[PDB]
Amino acid sequence: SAVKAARYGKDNVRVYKVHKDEKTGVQTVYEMTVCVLLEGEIETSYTKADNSVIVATDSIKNTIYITAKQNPVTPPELFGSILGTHFIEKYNHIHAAHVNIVCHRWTRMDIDGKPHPHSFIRDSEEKRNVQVDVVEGKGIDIKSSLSGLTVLKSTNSQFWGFLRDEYTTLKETWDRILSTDVDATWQWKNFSGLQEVRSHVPKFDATWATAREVTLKTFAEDNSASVQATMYKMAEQILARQQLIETVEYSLPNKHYFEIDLSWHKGLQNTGKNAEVFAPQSDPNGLIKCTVGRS
Amino acid sequence: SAVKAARYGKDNVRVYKVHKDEKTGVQTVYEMTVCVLLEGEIETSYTKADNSVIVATDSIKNTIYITAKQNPVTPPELFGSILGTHFIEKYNHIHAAHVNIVCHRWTRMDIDGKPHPHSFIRDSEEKRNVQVDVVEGKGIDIKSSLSGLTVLKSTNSQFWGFLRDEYTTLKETWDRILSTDVDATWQWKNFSGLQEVRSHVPKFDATWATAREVTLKTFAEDNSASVQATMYKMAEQILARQQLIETVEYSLPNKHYFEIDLSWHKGLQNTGKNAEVFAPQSDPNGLIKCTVGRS
Amino acid sequence: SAVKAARYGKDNVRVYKVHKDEKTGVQTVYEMTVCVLLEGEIETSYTKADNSVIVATDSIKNTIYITAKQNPVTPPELFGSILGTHFIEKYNHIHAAHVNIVCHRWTRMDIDGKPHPHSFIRDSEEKRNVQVDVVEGKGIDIKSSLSGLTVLKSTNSQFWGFLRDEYTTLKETWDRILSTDVDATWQWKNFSGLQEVRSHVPKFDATWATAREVTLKTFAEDNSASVQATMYKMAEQILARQQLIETVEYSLPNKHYFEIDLSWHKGLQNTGKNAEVFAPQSDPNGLIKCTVGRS
Amino acid sequence: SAVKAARYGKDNVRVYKVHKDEKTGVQTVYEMTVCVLLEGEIETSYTKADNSVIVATDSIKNTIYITAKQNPVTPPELFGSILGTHFIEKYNHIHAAHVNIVCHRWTRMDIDGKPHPHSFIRDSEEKRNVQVDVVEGKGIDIKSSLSGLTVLKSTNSQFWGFLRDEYTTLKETWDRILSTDVDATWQWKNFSGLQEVRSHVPKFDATWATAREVTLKTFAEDNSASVQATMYKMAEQILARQQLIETVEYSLPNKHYFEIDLSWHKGLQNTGKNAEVFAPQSDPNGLIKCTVGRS
Ligand SMILES: O=c1[nH]c(=O)c2nn[nH]c2[nH]1
Ligand SMILES: O=c1[nH]c(=O)c2nn[nH]c2[nH]1
Ligand SMILES: O=c1[nH]c(=O)c2nn[nH]c2[nH]1
Ligand SMILES: O=c1[nH]c(=O)c2nn[nH]c2[nH]1
Ligand SMILES: O=c1[nH]c(=O)c2nn[nH]c2[nH]1
């Protein structure tokens, strides 16, 4: 037997960084959770108890905290590129650094209508994430994503004309609730290294905001033929509004709201056009996935 | 042996209600999770397999869905009063109905700056809750609450002058991070019945909003002497801005952000006034509780 | 306004203790999560920023770790009595200590059929808990519990003869699945202080084991007339097999497994006596509660 | 733009199956959660609102319930092969079926030492899983796994001799706690189709049990040089005890138990060889991964 593949590192490193402006007196906070896994010439650590090759996970932990000290933590695409680059450059035998970041929202608190200088709220559990892969020779791969964007529309969704057979029981419909948790991942064209990432920084924060805008706009206005149809439209536009994206990937669960028929009770009319009260379903859920690139 | 106390019912009933305005074309959605437990003359169901006394939990489930059909679901204080009242009036042997509601945020989506008529986002995991207890003879007790309000301030919190002894190691401080998840519960003066609840309805939605405003304002501006000091101030004001509240209760966990000392590394200065990067702590957490009434 | 009630302390203190036998070479591990909240003359900490009265939560954290060092951590009833007593005796102004412990299972690993001396598995997420309340003057109140005992029986449960009305749709049944997560809490007669707890120690571990045995035996063999009927029987016996219990409390959710009718598909027969495949329901759930004492 | 990749289906389908032996009177229960995603010629459903190509997720839900009715649900490798095969054979335009199953433990209850015929306990949250990929032309790929196996050893783990530099602070050690949640995935050599799966069935249940045995045995007895070293040894043996495995993959988080130094308190000695009481750490965690094949 032999080691086909190996990576190791530190997961779930919670990190908080405060930037204190002395002019304005205005503080800004950033909170991340960071994962770093390294690959390279480390298989002897697995086969020959050879720890000489192991950069301790604790040191990787340390290094995250240092790198966040010595460098900006935002935008995460950059921070992850920095942190990843660090480990391949620092260590001869480490040939890949895989950095995952989840950004937790700390939104400035409005007080009577005045951005408070040092108070924030977690205004949503919506996450911004990156997956940065820094590989010796092959530059830097970046996947940016938003996840946990939970939305619903009460009408202006349909689903009709789907295969019917001895396994079908679902009734065609022209009016229904559509609700989903949006997972939207855009993959950047490979960068040569840290310099090229540094040059594209403004596009990171800017493209994230666009993915969100588009997801929400499209979800809202599209008289959805299906989840399939509506997710494709979102992906179309993110590609079209930013050239450096090679691929957009949506994963959308269909959180079903069933009709409750209460006609058995004093002929009470709650289905079809008289549908008011629905039983939101926890499980099961449709899951719909799409990857979209350039033709 | 004997039954000292007994309640039963249906938990985790997810409920969704849509209100379709035909003038404006504008839809509004409400989503709840509801629990109902009944008490009364039911001990034989426990001791003598006497199911004659059991209003099936399934029927209670049905009844929730019906009551939401036939009545407004908002504000929850009212819906819970209605749903509770129903069961004590309907059934001779049921002498108490305990209704718990959690309201899940569906905020109208802004699109280019125009309230969309039928699209919503779950803009926070912050919950509005009620606990309605409807007891034959003793009218209606209501506890309204907000929970899951996660906040943080980077400065303008202190904690000094606390007991020191052979068990103390914590260093006094004049500048620190304070972060908490706010649990704020206000208890209404007993109502006589459903009529009196119905007459106080405008105060429900209005008092909730005030509890939130006050929690956020006070948390922000107060140069906190302690969590104790700051939570008391919040409770003070909620009492003072609404007469029908008998008691305000805060429960606040202290989510600690530890300083990371990186001086061992190239003399890097990250503590005291040079604190930038902190390790948010998952556990343990201070937990601080206060109930405040009228003197 | 005024402080009606106040408690504070440290929550979620994870604690691990190893006992190294030097004769046998055999190690034993205990892992807890501990919460301590104190009451007493502390209201000035809330009203007058008077921190002099606050035993820092950090020190309480320290004290837990010390007390576990200097004392046995098992059984939890005792550890909690010790830890609680400590704080009322040590501090003049602290008049109550509330200690909550959750014990996490570390079961010795069997290897070829030989208790390994230092390897363990978390063989279930079933928790043993205590709630110890140590109050100056009023001795020590103890509530012991088991929670998270997830069980199911495929048959030998029924539910018929329950109220039917214009809110009922549930069909009587003589054969069904019953599945629940067992919450069983037994309350000890008040102890005078730490000495009396110390004298009743053997009964703690011994009564816990009995509550479990009884819960499982009774759940299994009882042709349940209802959840009500079956939980009462369990409580009956725990009371009857240990004299120092004043009250037994069960909370049992009814995790429903619905029949799936597949007759619409090639006349496939899956209901009634031909029921094989069921859809386990996540929500809603019946919730059934009973407190049982001595008549 | 164009659809690079697409799959859709039903997730989180909870499924329960009872087998009633009429001879013995002995019932046996199986509970799964199932996910099915299909690929094939479905891109028009995304681009042209062409629902004709969509096998409704609801029908896929139905099909799972039927397939479990008409076929054995155990072992999951087989059930998943059956369920996957079904969809590629049934539908001309569906070219791949991806089936994920999680098996939830229902262990027969021992009562006085007699396997009860119809009562079971969820004796662990340890999961058995499969990932079955059924692709038109390319037969059936199966990944079997165990996850959520939470273990700990108090001693007989070490970690010394690892790279040290200006980022290192971790102290070498010869005695420490090692604790992890085991994720062990074994990948089967490709099968031609359902017949070949059917012929290898006895090996499925049998290889799972071996992966568990080996994981536990090796974890226990190995004086671990590192997590790396110990996971490799486990993988080695699973490969060596079953020929049809092509690759074994372990993912092991290192759940750290920190030493608490209590010397500041009455010179209390709790570090090094006097370590008794430790603070289990929730985060961060080392994460260690290895894939092992045949050289
Ligand atoms: O948008 C949808 N896509 C689907 O594939 C589907 N299946 N059931 N409902 C559905 N809705
Ligand atoms: O309201 C429902 N809609 C559905 O699509 C469905 N499928 N099974 N039961 C159902 N109920
Ligand atoms: O606000 C606080 N109150 C307390 O009681 C405490 N203890 N440690 N830190 C603290 N902060
Ligand atoms: O930064 C810290 N602050 C604290 O209050 C504390 N208590 N133990 N370790 C600690 N670290
Ligand atoms: O045991 C039960 N008790 C109940 O009260 C009930 N209601 N529906 N099913 C039930 N089962």
Ligand SMILES: O=c1[nH]c(=O)c2nn[nH]c2[nH]1
């Ligand atoms: O199988 C079912 N059993 C029930 O008790 C029930 N109640 N609503 N739908 C149901 N389905």
Ligand SMILES: O=c1[nH]c(=O)c2nn[nH]c2[nH]1
């Ligand atoms: O087994 C280990 N492997 C590692 O790579 C490591 N790093 N810190 N501790 C560790 N333990």
Ligand SMILES: O=c1[nH]c(=O)c2nn[nH]c2[nH]1
């Ligand atoms: O006890 C500890 N062990 C460690 O490996 C470590 N790393 N930071 N703090 C620590 N404490």
Ligand code: NA
């Ligand atoms: Na390198």
Ligand code: NA
């Ligand atoms: Na009544």
Ligand code: NA
């Ligand atoms: Na005292």
Ligand code: NA
């Ligand atoms: Na096909």
